[PDB]
């Protein structure tokens, strides 16, 4: 009645042995955790990274949040110090319940959250912080520079230090040269009671890993990747405004929605309370949302393993159908790894090889199709030198890299090879095929990968 909590997600407690390598561990739990979308990881008892900062010298500009179910909010984007925010947050919670701030049971904040977001008479607003690390506000993990204490140095090179996570070698987003600060740098979240993150999946269907440094718990709802489209159909029916096309990546619309609504429509949902010192991991295309119990501080980062590579290609195809902007070119990333085949991990090399073989076979078919449409002229073109906004398909907005069609009639404009009929009204003999590599360039790049993989 009123609120029925979803069943709990899996909780893992690895030994020091299992915990040593994050990628081997995540691959171990994957068959379990991918069935629930999220999972929680409790580190070994002595793994305790030092948190230290001056609460007075850390400044940030907060976002204001209206808490209404099914109401549209924008995904990304006054002045508080950590101390002044903390004082505002604690007084807010304390006055809301007329209780000392942690005699308030977690079960009660949860059912109160879902009551207040559904009730139209209530117009509660709250605030929070969301930002990547900078000089005014940096990582909660130790980083290099300032002399460090011997304990900080122990955790400088930890796999679970989230600054290191992207640039490790079993990560694929590693050697991407193109800037993607949005999804390779860690984000910092300063929470208060009821501040919340709307339902979403990560860019390019990547994993994420989330660490709560300190403070009151963070409550999570997660849906497995196989049910992503079920959830979207439920949401399209109850709030179609979120699904109208939007002009860019800075205009993605998201919302709050009761898990019981999803469970009623046969969408599997799981929950957890994440406490300080614990990790939450989200899997590819796993929807998630949640809210904070009180004043707290969390840090999160995207990442991509070799397991993810095929899904990443399916995702870009899915973006094309929806006319959504990409954050980077998936093909450009494959070719960059191929060109560095000699210094790649051998498991990586083998998995890149398989994706590249698919890429090449698809590119062959596409070029044959545009040739039969009467496009004859062609010229090599270094797509990776163009700013992203200068190489999106006019029709489907995909970021071009392997090839595109241009016409002297519309200078600067491009379409991908799926949308040759959408560029202009000139006859096809006036078009040029622009390509990064000939098929003959590509087969030796793939062979280099096969040799490295043996
Ligand atoms: O505020 C937060 O904790 C989150 C935001 C986005 N994804 C997951 C968690
Ligand atoms: Cl409300
Ligand atoms: Mn997220
Ligand atoms: Zn033309
Ligand atoms: Zn296109």
From Swiss-Prot:
Effect ascribed to mutating residue 200 to Y: Abolishes lysine-specific histone demethylase activity
Start and end residues of each JmjC domain: 154-320
Residues bound to 2-oxoglutarate: 128, 208, 210, 218
Tissue: Ubiquitously expressed, with highest levels in testis. Down-regulated in melanoma and glioblastoma. Up-regulated in breast cancer (at protein level).
Positions contributing to Fe cation binding: 200, 202, 288
Zinc finger (C5HC2) stretch: 393-445
Domain JmjN: 9-50
Lineage: superkingdom: Eukaryota
Compartment(s) where it occurs, according to its Swiss-Prot or TrEMBL record: Nucleus
Disease: Intellectual developmental disorder, autosomal recessive 65: A disorder characterized by significantly below average general intellectual functioning associated with impairments in adaptive behavior and manifested during the developmental period. MRT65 patients have moderate to severe intellectual disability, developmental delay, and facial dysmorphism. Camptodactyly is present in some patients.
Function field: Histone demethylase that demethylates 'Lys-4' of histone H3, thereby playing a central role in histone code. Does not demethylate histone H3 'Lys-9' or H3 'Lys-27'. Demethylates trimethylated, dimethylated and monomethylated H3 'Lys-4'. Acts as a transcriptional corepressor for FOXG1B and PAX9. Favors the proliferation of breast cancer cells by repressing tumor suppressor genes such as BRCA1 and HOXA5. In contrast, may act as a tumor suppressor for melanoma. Represses the CLOCK-BMAL1 heterodimer-mediated transcriptional activation of the core clock component PER2.
Subunit structure: Interacts with FOXG1B, PAX9, MYC, MYCN and RB1. Interacts with HDAC1, HDAC4, HDAC5 and HDAC7. Interacts (via PHD-type 1 zinc finger) with histone H3 unmodified at 'Lys-4'; the interaction is inhibited when histone H3 is methylated at 'Arg-2' or 'Lys-4'.
Domain remark text: Both the JmjC domain and the JmjN domain are required for enzymatic activity. However ARID and PHD-type 1 domain are not required for activity per se but contributed to recognition of the H3(1-21)K4me2 substrate peptide. The 2 first PHD-type zinc finger domains are required for transcription repression activity.
Family note: Belongs to the JARID1 histone demethylase family.
Name of protein: Lysine-specific demethylase 5B
Organism per entry: Homo sapiens
Gene name in the database record: KDM5B
Residues of the full protein shown: 26 to 753 of 1544
């Amino acid at each position: 009645s009123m609120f029925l909590p979803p069943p709990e997600c899996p909780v893992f407690e690895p030994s020091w042995e299992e915990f040593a390598d994050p990628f081997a561990f995540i691959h171990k739990i994957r068959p379990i955790a991918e069935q629930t979308g999220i999972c929680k990881v409790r580190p070994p008892p002595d793994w305790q990274p030092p948190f230290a900062c001056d609460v007075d010298k850390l400044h940030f500009t907060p976002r204001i949040q209206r808490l209404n179910e099914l109401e549209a909010q924008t995904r990304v984007k006054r002045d508080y110090t950590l101390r002044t925010f903390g004082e505002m947050a604690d007084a807010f919670k304390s006055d809301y319940f007329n209780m000392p701030v942690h005699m308030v049971p977690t079960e009660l904040v949860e059912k109160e959250f879902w009551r207040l977001v559904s009730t139209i008479e209530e117009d509660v607003t709250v605030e929070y912080g969301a930002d990547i690390a900078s000089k005014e506000f940096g990582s909660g993990f130790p980083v290099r520079d300032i002399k460090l204490s011997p304990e900080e140095e122990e955790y400088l090179d930890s796999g679970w230090n989230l600054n290191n996570m992207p640039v490790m070698e079993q990560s694929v987003l590693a050697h991407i040269t193109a800037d993607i600060c949005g999804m390779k740098l860690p984000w910092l979240y300063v929470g208060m009671c009821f501040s919340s993150f709307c339902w979403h999946i990560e860019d390019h269907w990547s994993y994420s890993i989330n660490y709560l440094h300190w403070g009151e718990p963070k409550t999570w709802y997660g849906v497995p990747g196989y049910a992503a489209e079920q959830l979207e159909n439920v949401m399209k029916k109850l709030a179609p405004e979120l699904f109208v096309s939007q002009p860019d990546l800075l205009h993605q619309l998201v919302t709050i929605m009761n898990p019981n609504t999803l469970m009623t429509h046969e969408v599997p949902v799981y929950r957890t309370n994440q406490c300080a010192g614990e990790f939450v991991i989200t899997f590819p295309r796993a929807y998630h949302s949640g809210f904070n119990q009180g004043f707290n501080f969390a840090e999160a980062v995207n990442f991509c393993t070799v397991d993810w590579l095929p899904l990443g290609r399916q995702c870009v195809e899915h973006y094309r159908l929806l006319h959504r902007y990409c954050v980077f070119s998936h093909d450009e990333m494959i070719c960059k790894m191929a060109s560095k085949a000699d210094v790649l991990d051998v498991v990586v090399a083998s998995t890149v090889q398989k994706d590249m073989a698919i890429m090449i076979e698809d590119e062959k078919a596409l070029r044959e199709t545009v040739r039969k449409l009467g496009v004859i002229d062609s010229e090599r073109m270094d797509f990776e030198l163009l700013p992203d906004d200068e190489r999106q398909c006019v029709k489907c907005k995909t970021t071009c890299f392997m090839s595109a069609i241009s016409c002297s009639c519309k200078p600067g404009l491009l379409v991908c090879l799926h949308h040759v009929k959408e560029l202009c009204s000139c006859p096809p003999y006036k078009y040029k095929l622009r390509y990064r590599y000939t098929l003959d360039d590509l087969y030796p790049m793939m062979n280099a990968l096969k040799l490295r993989a043996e």
